[PDB]
Design a protein around this ligand. Sequence first.
Ligand SMILES: Cc1ccc(NC(=O)c2cccc(F)c2)cc1O
Ligand SMILES: [Zn+2]
Ligand SMILES: [Zn+2]
Ligand SMILES: [Zn+2]
Length: 461
Amino acid sequence: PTHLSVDTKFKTEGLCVDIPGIPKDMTYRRLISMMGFKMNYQVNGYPNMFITREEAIRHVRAWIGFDVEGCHGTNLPLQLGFSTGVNLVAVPTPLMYKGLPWNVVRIKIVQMLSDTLKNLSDRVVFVLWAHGFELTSMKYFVKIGPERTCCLCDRRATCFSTASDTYACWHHSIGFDYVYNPFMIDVQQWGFTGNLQSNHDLYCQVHGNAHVASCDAIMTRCLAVHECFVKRVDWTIEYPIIGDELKINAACRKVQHMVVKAALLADKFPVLHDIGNPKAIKCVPQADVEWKFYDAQPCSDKAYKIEELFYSYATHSDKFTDGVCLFWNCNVDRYPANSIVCRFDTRVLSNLNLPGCDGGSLYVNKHAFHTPAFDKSAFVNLKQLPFFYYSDSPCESHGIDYVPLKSATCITRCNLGGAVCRHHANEYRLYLDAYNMMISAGFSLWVYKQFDTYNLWNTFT
Ligand SMILES: Cc1ccc(NC(=O)c2cccc(F)c2)cc1O
Ligand SMILES: [Zn+2]
Ligand SMILES: [Zn+2]
Ligand SMILES: [Zn+2]
């Protein structure tokens, strides 16, 4: 039960307007045959062009929505739209390109997928709401065969060139003309009522429907992300390393210990309310405070209402007003004034952050986390946390060449005393680097307005 049997049934109702007379009884095997591909009973890593929901979900980084509209069937021109916002017109003879033959259109398809996917995935998954023309158009830009490797590296082959008769991955495909061994999934097999627009629009107000093909392609991927990562969530599925995942996760642990340690030293809160991941550990384990945990899973859909987190049914809610609240990636509509907050900025551009549903983003770093749209109004009671480095650690080298550090934000005994020691300068530069890493990954840090780093200097006396 790993791969999708070619002898599985494919519901054909969706296809019968572009393909009138299509049999109600249809297998992937006969559909793939109809699309013009020969699978020559082959056991070489590519048993099916089509894949399971489960397989699509392991490969969410490879998803490209794809839609074709009959512009006025070998007879007529076709509008090719992709979730990248690109529209190509192919003649048989927002970005919108004039009519060209398949032999140039196919080169543009390879360039576009390569530049989109080379830092994301080892493959492409075309996400369809299939009506027929997208499926019969694939023969014009796709070739299949046994799994292969790039002619320049060890990565699996995703492209093919007729000019050179060679195979490339997404990194090495410049001037290649065919997509090689693509995958695909028809969202219309998932058992929806009514059309794409009506299903999409239930969940998402951000993607309009200008009635161009890219609009449908974007909506199709959006609906699919909603179904696989918002309504349903599976946090067991791991995802490969493709960038700075480890450095970023380490940075977030370092910034969290630093900021909460400094807050406790500066304002000496008697109680900390730690709201969010039910597996969360004390980020400052030596600190004096009453540490009280509150369980909330990552909200995939809408930010939590603070009122709902405090709603206690027939018992009294704990008083939040006492001490400080820590929301470390726990996304609520409006934070209380006495909060420390880490909140992921869905708008950030990175290889980890994929476009999501209704203005949210799918952040994929070991696990996949759909995050509700970033909203500045959530922080009305807070201010941005300023950068600072704090250490009570002794001034002591042990065992990196030097320019001496001067900074107002290096809060150590040595800087109090007039000259930063080498140990604290090394630690300061490492911590500035981790902080910059975390910010540029898309985390934003907010704090109660009374927070003042001036209060930290008298913890050395
Ligand atoms: C900061 C903070 C977060 C959460 C709560 N919530 C409760 O105390 C509570 C008690 C019983 C059932 C329940 F669902 C919630 C209070 C807080 O002060
Ligand atoms: Zn390669
Ligand atoms: Zn949408
Ligand atoms: Zn020092």
